[PDB]
Amino acid sequence: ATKSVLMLGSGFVTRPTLDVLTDSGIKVTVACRTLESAKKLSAGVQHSTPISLDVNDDAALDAEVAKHDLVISLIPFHATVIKSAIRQKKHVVTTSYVSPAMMELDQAAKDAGITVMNEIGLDPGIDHLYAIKTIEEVHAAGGKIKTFLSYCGGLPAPESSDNPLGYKFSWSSRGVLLALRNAASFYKDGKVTNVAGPELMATAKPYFIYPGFAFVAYPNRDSTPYKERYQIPEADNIVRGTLRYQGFPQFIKVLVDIGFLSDEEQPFLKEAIPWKEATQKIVKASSASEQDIVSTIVSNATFESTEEQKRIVAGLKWLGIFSDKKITPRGNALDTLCATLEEKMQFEEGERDLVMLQHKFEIENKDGSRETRTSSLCEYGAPIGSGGYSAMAKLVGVPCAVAVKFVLDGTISDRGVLAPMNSKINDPLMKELKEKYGIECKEKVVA
Amino acid sequence: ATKSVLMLGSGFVTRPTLDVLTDSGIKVTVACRTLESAKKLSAGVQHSTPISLDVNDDAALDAEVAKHDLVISLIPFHATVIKSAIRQKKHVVTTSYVSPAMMELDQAAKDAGITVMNEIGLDPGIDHLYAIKTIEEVHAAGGKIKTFLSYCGGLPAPESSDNPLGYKFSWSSRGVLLALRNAASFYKDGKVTNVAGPELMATAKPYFIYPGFAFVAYPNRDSTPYKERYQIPEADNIVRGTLRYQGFPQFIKVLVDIGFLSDEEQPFLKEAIPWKEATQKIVKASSASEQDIVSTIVSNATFESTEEQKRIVAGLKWLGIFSDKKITPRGNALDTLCATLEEKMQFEEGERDLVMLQHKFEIENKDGSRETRTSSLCEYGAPIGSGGYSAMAKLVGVPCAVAVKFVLDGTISDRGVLAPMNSKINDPLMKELKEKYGIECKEKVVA
């Protein structure tokens, strides 16, 4: 009964998932575009095998999928992976949202007799388990969920947050930045509300959680489907979003107004030219001198105060965009900036990760009374270089590994395209995560 | 040349100091009022000896002081200890401020040929070393210190800060609370300014340091002497104070207005009566019901918003002052409350400590230009129960241990009552702390 799994992905989360599975006697073949990449994320790990595989090659994917009992997709390609799993009749586990194309394969998945478990990372994943656990507790008590809010963020521990964005990139900064262009839809005062663009960041206000942290919160993706998903018809306000630290909204805006986020390719950004010229050109400065560039930046951009302005300007200088530092030529203002962002804002040795996840429920009790309850999870990662897991890697990778084990042993047996949307699936998942890994959200009241 | 030291104190900081000294071959006799207390803080530690000693007994103190080469005072008794050291001609090291009574013994200390090194903990101590290092660097460059600000705080790591005050007591909460009554004096716009009482907390505004933290800052003790001590005659603003987290100023005020900080002993607070009655009595409530007590509390106290009010009220309830929980009878409202505070707000297993120290200098450069520079130190302690040091214990205890070693080997040879107020003393201290323990403040510019 030695089960084997095909793991797709050459990223952050792969390790914890790999460790947990192999530690359980489950064999895992790690597939990346490159053999090196796979060799890396698998060196020294028992029961693992690295290979080069082109996931977009339908014929090649099917051949490899058939050799295992389940395929794990931690990569970007989801429907394609599911279609192969359907042809080969193997199960699937992903940490991504169920998209329209994935749901479209629901019936075909059921006919092939396979389970496609999605949204079982940190968020989506752990957040679903505890949001639903609490909602059902409330409802069981005859209470009403009038407002449901959920915010989550993978950030630098405060200790190591001293950079312009109070943020450290693990994945492409280009992706993070462009994502801020996406529209967010949610329920407010009982009505569907849409927000995007500067407006999104202009709405990112301070959001209290614990005294020691200074978070700001904003809507992310589509929250409207949850009135149905979490069965909270009585909810007037439903919002799922992300957490950032104070100052993030403001530095992002300046980068925008300065035009550094332009996707446009410039002929003058093809060679390693000093940062000075780049910015002076991108900004429209009379010269490459700090004075001029800075005077153009401020005179055109609006700030909250002289101090914020002073701070944001020093932040820009800190990036090195006003220096003799040659650029990492990428043709795009955004791309070029991102290269430097990557270099200047990464987690370094000894630094720690931080995950904050908090659901908030304003409740109207059976007795007519009211109360506000929270369900929170706050965890720090192990220092870089210590060999331990970052908080993000652990909280995404372990839930995924647990789901994989449950689909393989039958604990999760529903066929089709699924998400952790009910106690039949969620209870076993929460019990294993908490009892075996100490992973859980704790409840508390306020109001 | 086997030196020996008499260590006075049965507290938090004793361990790191003890460990460092004994690890250096220095014998230490740990003295506490109780032999048990001493036996505790010394069990299993090589080259240490515990004893019972009454520091207030002049004859007893002299006898013991004479048996060692130096006396370390980490206890509350300073002048008394110094007088004994003067009679016995032994050296002294303390982590406290040089008081008028201590300075009065300066000449007598010099005549006895001894060194009395004070203010060598974290704050006072490390803060002095780096404030002076930076000021001299600036002055060397011909710059002017127009404003000097320094704030420091020993707090719960954000992760474990979720309590009404965003604070955890290591030492008596009664002391902490009463200290908020002390007047703070500092320089503002070139003039001596005094602040105390509600005013002190009403002035505790948000103070930005790093994006991830939400600190508030306020003046502490006497900063005026520093215009001379740090030789910054050109400074218009000189302020040394403490850091707390957001919300601290507000919860303290409610406790005040509710009268919970009254020193008055009540005949009804002599027996273990349920918290309900206590508060209802102390507050002046129509009943011991949450409604009444809460209605009296709010109707009389003013808040920033309904939400803050809601939050602060839930915080009070969290303390258990509205419950059937019997009180730990202490006659005083403050004392009784403190017993519960002690119990509810302590560092527990797995929890981490946090020390934030930051000097800020607004400078006018030789070129007439201006700049703002900071010197910071941010450190987390080891989880309670892990056996490692808390940040506070390490940062107070290690600097002290280093000073002790320097007075014993001659590195610090000036006689009299001293403080780390110059490079002759400060440089060796900073070098050892940074090179051997990695303890230091890092500089950065802004503006």
mmCIF file of C-alpha atoms in Angstrom, chain B residues 97 179 182-186 200 218-223 239-242:
data_model
loop_
_atom_site.group_PDB
_atom_site.id
_atom_site.type_symbol
_atom_site.label_atom_id
_atom_site.label_comp_id
_atom_site.label_asym_id
_atom_site.label_seq_id
_atom_site.Cartn_x
_atom_site.Cartn_y
_atom_site.Cartn_z
ATOM 1 C CA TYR B 97 21.010 56.216 38.423
ATOM 2 C CA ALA B 179 5.525 55.493 38.874
ATOM 3 C CA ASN B 182 6.100 60.862 38.889
ATOM 4 C CA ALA B 183 6.854 64.177 37.227
ATOM 5 C CA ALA B 184 9.020 64.195 34.118
ATOM 6 C CA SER B 185 11.191 67.197 33.292
ATOM 7 C CA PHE B 186 12.745 67.880 29.901
ATOM 8 C CA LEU B 200 1.659 62.651 31.303
ATOM 9 C CA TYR B 218 6.113 59.721 26.901
ATOM 10 C CA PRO B 219 8.747 61.589 28.990
ATOM 11 C CA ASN B 220 10.246 59.764 31.974
ATOM 12 C CA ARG B 221 12.249 61.095 34.926
ATOM 13 C CA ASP B 222 14.621 64.067 34.643
ATOM 14 C CA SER B 223 16.087 64.776 31.193
ATOM 15 C CA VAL B 239 13.794 64.206 26.113
ATOM 16 C CA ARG B 240 14.367 60.730 27.559
ATOM 17 C CA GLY B 241 11.294 58.575 28.057
ATOM 18 C CA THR B 242 9.587 55.227 27.750
#
